[PDB]
Design a protein around this nucleic acid. Structure first.
Ligand SMILES: Nc1ncnc2c1ncn2[C@@H]1O[C@H](COP(=O)(O)OP(=O)(O)OP(=O)(O)O)[C@@H](O)[C@H]1O
Ligand SMILES: [Mg+2]
Ligand SMILES: [Mg+2]
Length: 1298
RNA sequence: AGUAG
């Protein structure tokens, strides 16, 4: 039952009115938005901005620090060990005591060394012994730390401890710029020195390792990369709750470098810094002699006493993987070079590239990520005909240039951009090479940009910046309401009152006739497609109950209810669903839940979206009623958008590319021709057709919009339904999200209560909140909410411009072909220019102007400009503003094809994943992290990476995971030590090599090595019957015994098929709301009485409350609802793999004891019929986008596997109704049950009639049902076999495999 | 002092 609503009516808008307005418009001097790209122009822009910078800021003479850890390597580095520190540290401390301090930091170094040397033998034994054998002592009160009292420190060190607890350089100057360039070049020269059998293996040991690894395997950047890994592992160890109050001293290399870790604040909070000093022998490497605290003179060498640093947990886990990030970036650069030149980079280029990448990965500053974010938009701006490069250049100077790595990364940027704005071959950025494609040049800067961590900003400044945008745009909206009534901003301005003013065409104001005409223009392609559109709209399930869909019972954020203090409480969607179900006696449809909450005002707050850009973005969290309204609107608009061929975002990811290519091909085929313009009687003029590809981007797409356009937009859209009830419901849904209560988050309010005085900057921001916690926001639709509706509206405006122009100049047969995706868009304006000198064309235009058609004044020279001006104006009539900064005009599609929007099928630079697989891991146990990393590397391979670059990343990630979890030789959890079997023969869940050629991880799945090991052991036992291949079966039986505890298939990650060792890193001791409303016993009897609901969501209020409480009382969702900071998890994992009992065998004992338990059980194992049966059951040039279907499900079924398996467990009326609703095709569930029973008799001797069989295949078929988009070189076919063969053909980088 | 501004 769709509720009645009043709805809108047509206003009789005529196209002729807009055409006449345009005629009057395109008859006068109109200023082009963009500027011409010329070398002199860019050079003058840079020089003038440099001149202004001096006045803008107060100049400084002392470059600030850019190196976090300063090291110095003279000899190859042998990784450190507990047996190495006891010797090194002693030698290094004797050296230090030999020195003579002068500065307070040097004095503190001296005091720490003197204390450490004078520790007693028992103190040292406890100081280096493992935590298991650790014994607390008077001096060494923790394993790897010692206690220094305030009495031993001298006066200088005491003063230094007490001290512990905007200016820019002359970039315009030439002396400063050369000085910085020389310093950074010296550092890069130092990091470039040389310190004194599957087919893929052949192609890797011959091509990649011969030119990349064997080249960097001897440079100072490959050994300092390990020195700064050990130095950061030491800090991570000394950044716990109990350790982080004591002093520590470590030595590395052979005593050359010493790390002095200070009394800090534990990094298990959100605002602590671990502080340290480094004393090293001055030499080649990351040395900045200007920023060293002192250089103490030694007879033969000189020791560089660094200054007391302070590195947070985001800059401490970013140096721990500096080497991996730098090496993966260098591998990507190597791959891109060996596609753009066809030859391997010379030995000299790759070493410099690696040195630059390492120096970038070490310097994790935010003043550099901003520059490398501006550069990505600057490079397309200076390599295109017309662009907004002056604005981007002026943005480049908005920041201080303080350290010597911003005056060098800038100087380089200046040179590169001034050189690119002249050849308009693309000069390289890092090396001295020259490219032959734009893709390589843009990928260089993209990769250099991803080497910076997400969220280096600083918390509260970014939170405030997030709030200010939304507050200021809303205040501007109110100002626009003060001028001209609120009935003009809300309902728009008629055309007749635009021509009288012509200044109403601003953002946040929309015409009425323009919107109606845009809807009518879409109705010319939605009217030949009426039945399909109606069927698509009805296909969306409105009657389907709310809260019975995965999206409404998810774990994403959602605002709660206005509390007593005035702030809007946070929560996740599942608690809100539970609350509504508890307070209501029904589970209502999407429409019937709207009319219940139609009265409630939409409320929203904003949470920082931790990203890697200047001026971080902010995600919007909205209450339940607002979510319901937005769901109604999006469900209506998506069903129509997916039926329009120019609105991308509604495509599957592999059709976005296959459609942009089709559009570009149609444009090119149009260009291959010549048009004839008629003259007085018979003479024709031949005009050459040409294309001008205009990319696009809108400034403040949602933040500066007015969400009342869609009210009149949908009232005219043709959906094909026989009645307007759903249309009117969508109109009302749009009407209720007009006004919102924006709540300032808790952090901003809390700190603003502490400011001594409020500047006018934020006083205008605190006047927007009359209550102090909330404010009214109109028009803005909470960025990220209406994305398909906005894109469809933009497409409508573009087609309106098409029609207006085609009516303006009937004689000229021009060609437009647009493609929109959110705000991003591509316009392919096709124009005509004279073939001869053109005097006849000019005469014809003059004759037309004289005849009476005065709008030809703007169609004589540069026809493509008067098309863009009119298109931009007609878009602005719909409150859409094409950006004057990030838009680009170019005769060639190189600038766009390199980028292709900013969606998800726009690769995602395959580097973004490879560098991502090194961090942000689930932390759910060795297996469940080694699976996630390999899966991310496989995705990177599927996103264009080469097998050799995607199989080096796998090795790097596997080694990092092994170090993190201790599964490394001679470390806490090495399987080979405790278990008799070798490292490669152990199942992955219990600790195994788990490293395979990326072909295995791609073609097959992750964890299939477990199945290989199981098959090997079973075959060996069956045929040879040797004792050797029975220990493995004992290990697998132990795995099943451990796994039997879990039920419901409560798996968050990969499926082992043989069970997993159970870990639990963290527990939110604070029980969640509504997590205890049924007795825990009740939720165990319910889980057995209603078996069906393990698969299909219940669709009844009473039977859904229990299901939601159960999903809330699950020890894998509760973990996922408190893993707010992945950095905290990654840091904790290193200290949890040790004695901490973080894995339960039913008794919460360490993983170290599990190896002994398995060795005991494996030895005392005997083959049994049940074991054999269970084991047998266990073993039952032009880019393009394809679908890699791995296994896929049997066609004869046609019913979702969970639905049918639930049908088998269906005995209650509620369960049967839920099954029938959930099943896509009812009346056929019995067919699939019969098919399953028949099939089980083939590959399995067990019968499904008894339970515990269907639980096995379901994860396998879930993995099979996964279908992923694969980026191929263009010659590949749709089938999986062709994709795999193409991957095979891509093993070599410069040689064919055909 | 450092991170940040
Ligand atoms: N994380 C996101 N999730 C969903 N939609 C998003 C997200 N980020 C941006 N959008 C969509 O893109 C719009 C913003 O576009 P974009 O990020 O290109 O820049 P902008 O805010 O329009 O302005 P400018 O081009 O000046 O940066 C948002 O209003 C929303 O429509
Ligand atoms: Mg944009
Ligand atoms: Mg954009």
């Amino acid at each position: 039952y769709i509720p009645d609503y009043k709805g809108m009516e047509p206003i009789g808008a005529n196209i002729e009115d807009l055409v006449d307005y345009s005629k009057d418009w395109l008859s006068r001097a109109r200023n082009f938005s963009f500027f011409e790209v010329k070398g002199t122009a860019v050079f003058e822009c840079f020089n003038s901005n440099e001149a202004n910078h001096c006045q803008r800021y107060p100049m400084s003479r002392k470059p600030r620090n850019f190196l976090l850890i300063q090291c110095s390597l003279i000899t190859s580095y042998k990784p450190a060990t507990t047996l190495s520190d006891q010797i090194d540290s002693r030698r290094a401390c004797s050296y230090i005591l030999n020195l003579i301090p002068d500065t307070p930091a040097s004095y503190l170094i001296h005091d720490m060394a003197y204390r450490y040397i004078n520790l007693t033998r028992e103190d040292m034994i406890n100081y280096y012994a493992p935590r298991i054998q650790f014994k607390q002592t008077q001096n060494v009160r923790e394993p790897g730390t010692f206690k220094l009292t305030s009495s031993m420190l001298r006066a200088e060190s005491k003063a230094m401890l007490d001290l512990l607890n905007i200016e820019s350089l002359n970039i315009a100057s030439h002396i400063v710029q050369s000085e910085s360039v020389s310093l950074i070049t010296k550092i890069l020269s130092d990091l470039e020195l040389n310190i004194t059998d599957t087919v893929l293996d052949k192609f890797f040991q011959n091509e990649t390792q011969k030119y990349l690894i064997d080249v960097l395997k001897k440079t100072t950047a490959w050994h300092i990369g390990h020195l700064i890994r050990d130095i950061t592992e030491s800090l991570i160890a000394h950044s716990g709750l109990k350790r982080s109050k004591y002093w520590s001293l470590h030595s590395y290399n052979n005593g050359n470098v010493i790390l002095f870790i200070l009394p800090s604040k534990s990094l298990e909070v959100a605002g602590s810094f671990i502080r340290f000093i480094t004393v090293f022998r001055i030499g080649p490497g990351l040395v900045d002699k200007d920023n060293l605290d002192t250089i103490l003179i030694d007879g033969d060498s000189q020791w560089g006493v660094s200054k007391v640093m302070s590195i947070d947990l985001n800059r401490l886990l970013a140096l721990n993987i500096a080497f991996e990030k730098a090496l993966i970036a260098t591998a990507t650069w190597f791959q891109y070079y060996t596609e753009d030149q066809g030859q391997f980079p010379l030995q000299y280029a790759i070493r410099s590239v690696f040195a630059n990448h390492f120096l970038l990965a070490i310097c994790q500053k935010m003043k550099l990520c901003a520059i490398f974010d501006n550069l990505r938009y600057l490079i397309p701006a200076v390599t295109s005909l017309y662009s907004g490069f002056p604005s981007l250049i002026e943005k480049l100077f908005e920041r201080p240039f303080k350290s010597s790595l911003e005056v060098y990364i800038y100087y380089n940027i200046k040179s590169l951009l001034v050189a690119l704005a002249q050849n308009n071959v693309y000069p390289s950025f890092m090396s001295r090479i020259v490219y032959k494609h734009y893709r390589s040049l843009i990928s260089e800067v993209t990769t250099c940009f991803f080497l910076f961590e997400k969220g280096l900003h600083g918390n509260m400044n970014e939170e405030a910046k997030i709030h200010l945008e939304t507050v200021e745009w809303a205040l501007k909206f109110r100002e626009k309401e003060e001028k001209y009534g609120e009935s003009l901003v809300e309902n728009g301005y008629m055309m007749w009152e635009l021509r009288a003013n012509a200044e109403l065409a601003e953002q946040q104001l929309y015409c009425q006739d323009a919107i109606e005409l845009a809807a009518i223009e879409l109705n010319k392609v939605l009217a030949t497609k009426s039945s399909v559109v109606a069927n698509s709209i009805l296909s969306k399930n409105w009657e389907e109950p709310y809260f019975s869909q995965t999206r409404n019972i998810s774990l994403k954020g959602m605002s709660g209810q206005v509390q007593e203090d005035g702030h809007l409480s946070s929560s996740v969607t599942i608690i809100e669903a539970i609350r509504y179900l508890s307070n209501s006696r029904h589970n209502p449809s999407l429409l019937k839940l709207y009319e219940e909450t139609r009265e409630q005002k939409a409320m929203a707050r904003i949470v920082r979206k931790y990203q890697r850009t200047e001026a971080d973005r902010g995600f919007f969290i909205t209450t339940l009623p607002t979510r319901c309204r937005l769901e109604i609107i999006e469900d209506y608009y998506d069903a129509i958008a997916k039926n329009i061929s120019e609105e991308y975002i509604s495509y599957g990811g592999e059709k976005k590319i296959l459609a942009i290519q089709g559009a570009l091909e149609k444009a090119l085929r149009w260009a291959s021709g010549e048009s004839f313009i008629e003259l007085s009687n018979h003479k024709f003029i031949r005009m050459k057709r040409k294309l001008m590809y205009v990319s696009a981007d809108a400034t403040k797409w949602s933040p500066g919009d007015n969400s009342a356009k869609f009210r009149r937009f949908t009232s005219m859209l043709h959906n094909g339904l026989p009645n307007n009830k759903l249309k009117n419901c969508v109109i009302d849904a749009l009407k209720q999200v007009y006004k919102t209560d924006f709540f300032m988050s808790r952090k901003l309010r809390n700190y603003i209560d502490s400011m001594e005085s409020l500047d006018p900057h934020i006083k205008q921001f605190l006047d927007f909140f009359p209550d102090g916690h909330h404010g009214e926001v109109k028009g803005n639709w909470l960025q990220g909410n209406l994305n398909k509706c906005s894109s469809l509206f933009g497409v409508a405006m573009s087609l309106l411009f098409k029609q207006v122009w085609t009516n303006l100049f009937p004689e000229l047969d021009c060609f437009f072909e647009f493609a929109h995706h959110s705000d991003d868009a591509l316009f392919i304006y096709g124009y005509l220019e004279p073939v001869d000198d053109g005097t006849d064309w000019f005469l014809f235009v003059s004759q037309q102007i004289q005849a009476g058609h005065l709008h030809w004044f703007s169609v004589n020279t540069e026809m493509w400009k008067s098309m863009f001006n009119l298109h931009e104006h007609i878009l602005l009539l719909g409150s859409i503003k094409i950006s004057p900064k990030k838009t680009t005009v170019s005769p060639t599609n190189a600038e766009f094809l390199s980028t292709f929007f900013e969606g998800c099928a726009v690769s995602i630079p395959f580097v973004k994943i490879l560098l991502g697989s090194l961090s942000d891991l689930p932390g759910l146990g060795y297996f469940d992290d080694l699976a996630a990393a390999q899966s991310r590397c496989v995705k990177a391979l599927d996103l264009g990476a080469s097998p050799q670059v995607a199989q080096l990343a796998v090795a790097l990630c596997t080694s990092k995971v092994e170090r993190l979890y201790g599964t490394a030789p001679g470390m806490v959890n090495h399987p080979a030590a405790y278990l008799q079997v070798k490292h490669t023969d152990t199942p992955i869940p219990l600790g195994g090599n788990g490293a395979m050629s990326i072909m295995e991880l791609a073609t097959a799945g992750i964890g299939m090595s477990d199945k290989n090991l199981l098959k090997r052991a079973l075959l060996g036992y069956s045929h040879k019957r040797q004792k050797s291949m029975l220990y493995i079966l004992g290990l697998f039986k132990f795995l099943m015994k451990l796994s039997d505890e879990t039920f419901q298939h409560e798996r968050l990650g990969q499926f082992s098929f043989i069970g997993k060792v159970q870990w639990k890193i963290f527990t939110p001791k604070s029980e969640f709301e509504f997590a205890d409303m049924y007795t825990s016993k009740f939720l165990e009897l319910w889980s057995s009485q209603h078996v069906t609901y393990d698969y299909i969501i219940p669709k009844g209020r009473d039977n859904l409350l229990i299901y939601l409480v159960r999903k809330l009382n699950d020890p894998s969702i509760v973990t996922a609802m408190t893993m707010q900071s992945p950095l905290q998890l990654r840091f904790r994992m290193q200290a949890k793999q040790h004695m901490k009992v973080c894995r339960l065998d039913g008794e919460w004992v360490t993983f170290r004891e599990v190896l002994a338990a398995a060795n005991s059980f494996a030895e005392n194992y005997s083959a049994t019929s049940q074991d054999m049966d269970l084991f047998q059951t266990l073993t039952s040039r032009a880019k393009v986008a394809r679908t890699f279907t791995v296994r896929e499900k049997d066609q004869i079924i046609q019913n979702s596997i969970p639905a049918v398996i639930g049908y088998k467990f269906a005995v209650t009326v509620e369960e049967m109704s839920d099954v029938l609703d959930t099943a896509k095709f009812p009346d056929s569930l019995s067919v699939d049950l019969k098919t399953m029973k028949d099939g089980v008799y083939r590959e399995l001797g067990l019968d499904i009639s008894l339970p515990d069989v269907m639980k096995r295949i379901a994860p396998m078929l879930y993995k099979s049902s996964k279908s992923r988009v694969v980026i191929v070189q263009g010659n590949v076919e749709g089938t999986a076999e062709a994709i795999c063969r193409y991957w095979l053909k891509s093993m070599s980088l410069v040689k064919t495999i055909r």
